[PDB]
Amino acid sequence: MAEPLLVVGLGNPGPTYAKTRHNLGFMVADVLAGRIGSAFKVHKKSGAEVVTGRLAGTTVVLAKPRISMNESGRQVGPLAKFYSVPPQQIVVIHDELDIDFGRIRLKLGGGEGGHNGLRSVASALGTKNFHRVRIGVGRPPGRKDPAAFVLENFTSAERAEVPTIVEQAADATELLIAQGLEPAQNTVHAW
Numbered sequence: 001m002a003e004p005l006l007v008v009g010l011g012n013p014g015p016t017y018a019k020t021r022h023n024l025g026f027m028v029a030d031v032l033a034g035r036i037g038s039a040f041k042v043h044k045k046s047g048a049e050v051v052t053g054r055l056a057g058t059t060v061v062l063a064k065p066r067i068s069m070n071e072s073g074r075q076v077g078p079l080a081k082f083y084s085v086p087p088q089q090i091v092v093i094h095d096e097l098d099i100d101f102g103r104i105r106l107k108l109g110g111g112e113g114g115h116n117g118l119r120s121v122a123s124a125l126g127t128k129n130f131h132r133v134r135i136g137v138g139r140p141p142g143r144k145d146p147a148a149f150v151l152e153n154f155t156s157a158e159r160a161e162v163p164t165i166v167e168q169a170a171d172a173t174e175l176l177i178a179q180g181l182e183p184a185q186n187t188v189h190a191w
Contacts, residue, residue, distance in 0.1 A: 004052075004059035005177055006085045007032065008076055010094045010117040013066045022069065022150040024095040024135045024166070025117070029064050031170045040064060045082055048075040056174040061085075069117040073124030080125060090130035091176065093169060094118060097146050099136030101158060102165055104172050106185040107132045114146045131176065135169045 009029025010022075017023050033040055033051045040049035043063070051062040061083055065072040080090060088108070098113050099105055109129040112118040122128040140149035154162055176184040 002059055002083075003089070004061050004083060004085065005089045005091060006076075006080055006083065007055075007060055007062045007173065007177075008090065008092045008121070009062070009064050010069065010072060010092060010115075010121075011064065012069050017151070019153050020151050021095050021137045021154060022117075024137070024162075024169070025093040026064055027162070027166045028093045028133070028135070028169045028173065029062055031166055032062050032173065035170065035174075036060070036062065042066070043079065043082075046075050046078040048079050050079070056177040058177060060177070070120060072117050073120035073122075076121050077124030087125055087127050087130045090125070091133060091173065092118065092121060092130060093133045093135065093173060095137045095150055096134035097137060097139055097150070099134055099138075101136050101138040102161065103136035104165075104169055104188055105134045105136070106172060106176055106181060106188060107134060108181055116147070131181065133169055133173050133176065135165065 009025035011026030012022060036051055036053040036055055038051050040051050043050040049064040049066050063079055065075040067075055094115055094117060096113060108131050140146055172188050
């Protein structure tokens with residue numbers, strides 16, 4: 001008697017990447033786990049780090065793959081089947097190049113931008129119809145390649161407000177779960 005939502009934070013494992021742009025997904029997930037009150041434990045049948053509990057009024061399974069961005073699909077897929085979670089009930093948090101730094105957008109399906117983690121997930125699920133909480137990071141300075149840019153740390157001026165942004169992403173995420181996409185994205189969007 002359940003059928004929970006799967007909330008997935010994308011990022012790369014290890015201290016080496018903990019603070020890079022490509023790890024926004026992990027940062028948000030760590031905040032959500034802090035709201036639920038439990039630390040992550042390894043889900044042995046999938047190898048993913050997981051937290052289960054009550055979040056935003058419903059049952060949630062919060063996860064972080066402890067395998068590299070490129071192969072995240074391998075753990076997210078099994079995890080989804082483990083709990084019989086339909087794609088529409090899957091929420092993936094990730095950094096986004098096509099949106100200005102500090103902006104947060106919510107989306108169901110659609111393109112994947114330049115995010116390799118997202119591709120691996122949609123590849124494993126066999127569909128792109130899952131929700132995303134897109135946390136803007138902006139576009140790289142000049143001629144620097146997107147893939148390289150997101151593997152760097154935030155500039156000192158950016159680092160000042162990443163903590164504010166992560167908390168807003170987590171709220172945006174909770175708002176999505178509780179209220180639904182349309183209400184949530186009407187509140188969180190502005191242009």
